[PDB]
Structures are given as structure tokens and as C-alpha cells.
Symmetry: C6
Subunit: 132 residues, 6 copies
Amino acid sequence: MIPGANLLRMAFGVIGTQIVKYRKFEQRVKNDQAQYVSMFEEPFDLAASVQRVRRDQYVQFNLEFQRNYVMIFANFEMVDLDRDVAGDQFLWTGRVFQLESQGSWFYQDGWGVCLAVDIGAAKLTDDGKPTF
Amino acid sequence: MIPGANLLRMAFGVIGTQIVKYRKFEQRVKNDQAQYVSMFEEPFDLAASVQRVRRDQYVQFNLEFQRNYVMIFANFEMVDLDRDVAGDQFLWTGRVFQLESQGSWFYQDGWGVCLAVDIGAAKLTDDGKPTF
Amino acid sequence: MIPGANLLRMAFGVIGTQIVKYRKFEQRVKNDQAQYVSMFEEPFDLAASVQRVRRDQYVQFNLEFQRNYVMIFANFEMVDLDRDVAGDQFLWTGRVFQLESQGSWFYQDGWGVCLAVDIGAAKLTDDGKPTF
Amino acid sequence: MIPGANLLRMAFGVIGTQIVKYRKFEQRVKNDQAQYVSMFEEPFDLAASVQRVRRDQYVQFNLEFQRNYVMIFANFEMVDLDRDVAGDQFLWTGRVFQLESQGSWFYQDGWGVCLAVDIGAAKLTDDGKPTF
Amino acid sequence: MIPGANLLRMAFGVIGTQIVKYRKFEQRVKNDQAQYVSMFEEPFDLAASVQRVRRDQYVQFNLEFQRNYVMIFANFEMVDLDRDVAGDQFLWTGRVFQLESQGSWFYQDGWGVCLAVDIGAAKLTDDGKPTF
Amino acid sequence: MIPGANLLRMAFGVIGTQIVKYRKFEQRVKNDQAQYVSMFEEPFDLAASVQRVRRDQYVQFNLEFQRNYVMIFANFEMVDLDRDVAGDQFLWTGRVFQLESQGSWFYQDGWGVCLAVDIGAAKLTDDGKPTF
């Protein structure tokens, strides 16, 4: 049935697909000073389509900021902010992105869409790999 | 006639449907402290299409929250919050959901659509069933 | 001519039609305490299509409310609130409804569309009829 | 040419027309108390399509009001409120209507569209005609 | 190429055009009291399509105002308000219009679209021409 | 694959293309008075489609302003304001423009779309070239 199967998997047959370095939330504990540190599973490659979102600059406290966004369609269960849970994280083009929204569709269909925000430059390995 | 019959019943012929554990309001009484306890009748299975709603995280009291939503099309009379009546409740993927909107269409057509919010993880039975 | 004739009358030829118990405003007088009491004509059956309106719960004074809406297409002159005139009332599925908006179209075409709110449960006759 | 000619005149060949009693602004002087009195030309009949506008009731000062609207397409120069000018007035179904908006299109094409609000019941002549 | 050439010039082949008396900003100097007087080039005829904009009346300081708008598509470079530069001015149907917005498209394509606001009645020449 | 390749490159085959003088940010230092001074790479010609954006005049501090916008589709990595990075700048028709939004699409497809504001008149070279 169409709401079953995997629509994004079939759609990946024709359109191209980028490879991101996904990384899943594991457990998250408090360091000193009540700032609260997150930890994650092992990274793994993910086949996803990362379309753009129009990012517009704004002004706050007389400074200029801009929130960088990407909308990722991926064939995986992607979970953002949740009670007792922090967001997920994926690397793309040497930039960290964490999910902000959650389009779900997983348990219905197996795929998902999420709006993710850039966080900062990725750490560079000794060999030149753009991963932590 | 087309406003009669059951359009969702015919639409279920082609598209797939999920099975949720629906549970209907019975009557509701006040415990101590004037907090007010709602109780229900026996659960029963329901064939419904549970599509997604874009859930976006927000900020309140310097904390970060996110309201989880699913839009359920079901071939049953579904009643949310009402004068002297509490909301209805269904179980899906081990998550409790309570209805928030009401698309009606029941007395006209026999089916309905409701926006429902996740409440929390379901209780796990001794045998492993994801029901209360 | 098409803006003449009656488009809803011919549209009723193919689609189904619900029977509501319409009731027209006659006069209203002030009882004690300066509140007005409304009186009405004799009830009469009306052939109309009563589609849904998305009703969403809200919060006021820390309580939870929800306004129940139905959009009625009927082949009759329907008038809601007016200067020196109170709104009309129709019964459907043992629920009272009063008109809130007014699509008019009567003097042009003969039919009309109105948004109507639920008021409460109908009075039950001794024989079980759901009419006042 | 199409922006020339008269598109509403051609459109009136197929769709029907309602006859309204139009009345054009002539001059206006102030009576006593600095309230200001409007005067008008002779009434004349006008063929126009008077479609509806969804009129929704509202609340002000704990009372309930509702502004009645009609959108009139007429093959005439219709002028509402203006500097040193008051709006025009047309009678339809024994009700006065004053123009509120102005769709212009006259000097381009010869016709116009205006949003008009009901003012009150028309005066009834001795013979029963519903004009002032 | 299509963004080159002149799309409005070709579009004028089929649709009709109105003739407006355009007039271009020259240089602008201050009279006494620091009110600041603008003056213009010689008027010249312009072939343009002057479509309507829905003008709606509003209330300010308990008075009633209404802003008269026309959207002019003309095959000429049209500049409204600018740093050190005043808006441009065209005459149509004996009414002065000053440009409000600026649809540009000139250096791309040669034509432009501007929203223009009525200023007032035109000066009448001795021979009856509706120009300054 | 279609999200690969370069859609704007082939789209330039049929539609026309303007030539702008692009200029990329290099570094930025604080001069005296703690204001930063931007400096850039060497200018280079860029092939892009610079469509209009509806620019409307507004009022601030009882003066009248207007922000001039252009939407540039270019087959290059274009970066506006960023943490520790100033926006890029391109010259077109003797006017300086700096990017404001960022449509991205580069690493996906190779092209991009940006909203750019006008800054002021270009510096005129001794030979008459409209470049810095």
C-alpha cells in the first residue's frame, strides 16, 4: 500500500542523494555548573536529500544575526528535542546541523523530513576527514 | 449519495491503514484536591490513517518545548474536549494521544478527522503489549 | 440566467441532503432584569447540507473551551444577529444551533450559507423526538 | 481592445442582472450643530450584479454588532468617500447601501466594482414602491 | 532572449494602452521655512496600462480618509522616492499621480510597474487641456 | 541526476543573462573607533539573472525611506552575513549591492539565489568604467 512501503526510497531511484554523517542521541548528563552535556552513538553514513531553506538575516540587540537552515529528507527515524531527550546531529559539507522540526512519517512510511540549523564548523581529522 | 455512504471506508480500499487502540470517555469524577480524574470505557481496535503534523520546537520560560501532533482520519465518531466531557484517547506506537481538534463529518458521512497530541509513553504489559 | 434560478436546488439533485428543524425569529421582549427573551415562529423542516467547520479547543481564564461550528447551505432566507433582530435557530442531531455569519445569496439566487454555533442538547419530547 | 470596450457589458449578456436604484452625490452643506448634511441627484435605475460578501458578527463594548456587505459590479462610474465629497447611495431589496471601497476600472473599461454597506430600511412610498 | 527584448512592448500589440502625461524629476531646492520644493523636466506623453488597485476607506483622528491608487505598467524607466531624489509624476484623467512603489524590470527588460497615489485635481489650461 | 548537475547552467541556455561585477569577502579588521572595515578579493565578472523585488517606500522618524532590492540567481557560491564574516558585494548598472538573504542550493546543485540591497552609486573610473 502507498502509505506503507517507502515513498522516499522509490523517489531516491530517480533524484540524486547526498551523503550526510548522521549521529544519534545516546544519553545526556549534567557536568558541573548545571550546564548539561549531551552524548551520542557512533556516527554512521545516511543517504538523504538536503534541500535549502531561505535564510534571512535579522537584527537583535543592535547586532546582525542569521539562522542557517537546511530541510533534510532522509529514510530514517529522526528525532529532535523531546522530553528527557536532546536533538540529533548530522554533518554535511563540514558543517554541524541539528534538527529543529520533525516531519515524522516514519512509522507510517519509513522516511522523515526535518528542519535543521547549522551549529558551526566541523572538527577536522588529522587525515583531512570533515568529521569529529 | 456522496455526502452519505462512507468516503473514508471506500478510500481505505486503496490506501493502507494503521491499527490504533482507541478508548472512549465513560464518566469522570473529582478526586481529592479538586484535581479531577477522567476514566474511560474498554479499549477497542480502530482502523485509521494517522498522518503527520509538522511539529516545531519553541521556547517558554527559557526552556525548550515541542508539541507532538498527529492528524488521525478514522471511521468513527470522535469527540475531544466538551462541556462536562473530557477528551478521548488512542494508543499508537506505544504513545498515548489525546484529541485536540474535531473535523466532525460523522453524522454527515460516518468518518472524522482529529488533531491529537502525544501525552507520553504507554504502559508496558507483562507480556510486552504496548497498552495500559 | 445562472445568477438567477437556484443553483443549490439543482445541486441537491445529485448530492445528499440532511433534514434540520429550522425555526425563525418572531419577536423578543425584555423580561425582568433587562435581559431579553427571544420568541420564534413555528418550527418547520428544512432541507440543507450541513458541512463541518474545523473546531479547535482554546484556553481562557485557565480553563479549556471549544466552540462547535457547522456551515449550513440551505435553500431559504437565513438571518443571524441584526439591529432589532435576534438570530435564527435550527435543530440537528439533537443539538441546537444558531447562525453566526451570513452568506446571503438569497435575493440573488434563493439559497444561502451560514456559520452556526452549537448551543446545547435538545429538549427530548415524551415520544422521544429531539425537538423543543 | 480588451482593456477598452466594456467587459462587464459583454458579461451581462449571459449572466443575469439585478436592478438597483442608484443615486449620485450632488452637494453637501452643514446644518446646525456642525453635523453635515448630504444631498444627491435624482435617483435612476442601474443594472448591476450585486454579489455577497461574508458578513460576520462581532462584539464591541460588550454588545453584538454585524456589518452587512454587498459587492456590486455595475457599468457606471461609482465614487465613494473622497476629499470634499461624500459617497454615493443605491437601493436594493428595500435596503439602503453606501459604497465603502472602489474597484475603479471605469476610465480604463467603463465598469466598476464597489463594496457597499447596508445603512437601514428603505422608506416606503404611499403606493408601496420601496424608494425614498 | 525573453528577459531581454521588451515583453511589455509586445504585450501592447494586443491589449490597449492609455496615454498619460509623464513628467520627470529635475533637481530640487528648499524654499523658506525648510519646506523643500521639487521641480521637474518638461512633460511628455507616455503609453502605459493603468490598472486599478482596490482602494478602501479608513478612519484616522475620527475622520474618514481614503488613499487612491493606480498600478501603472509603462515602457519607461520610472523612479519614485530615493535618497536626494523626489518621486516622479504623471497626469491621467485630470488627476495627478505620484509613484509609490517601484517594480523595476527596466535595466533587465526596458519596462516597469509602479503603484501610484492620486495627489489632487489637475490644473486646467485656458484652452481646456488637463495639464499644468 | 537532477538535484545534481546544474539546473541554472542549462536554464541560462534559453533565457538571457546579465553580467555583474562580483566581489568576495576576504578579511575584516577593526580600524580606530572599533568599527570594522571590510576588505575583499579581486573583483570578477559573474553571469547571473537579476530579477526585481517589489520595493515600497515607508516612513521612519517622520522621514520617508525606501529599501532597494534585487533577487540575483547566480551560478556561484554566494555568502551573506555570517558569524565572523561579512557579506559579499556585486556591482550592477553602476550600483553597489550586498546580499541579504541566502537561497543556498550550491552544494546541492552549484547555483544560488540571494536578495541584495542597494548601497549607493558606484565609483567612476578615469576611463568611465562603473567599477571600484
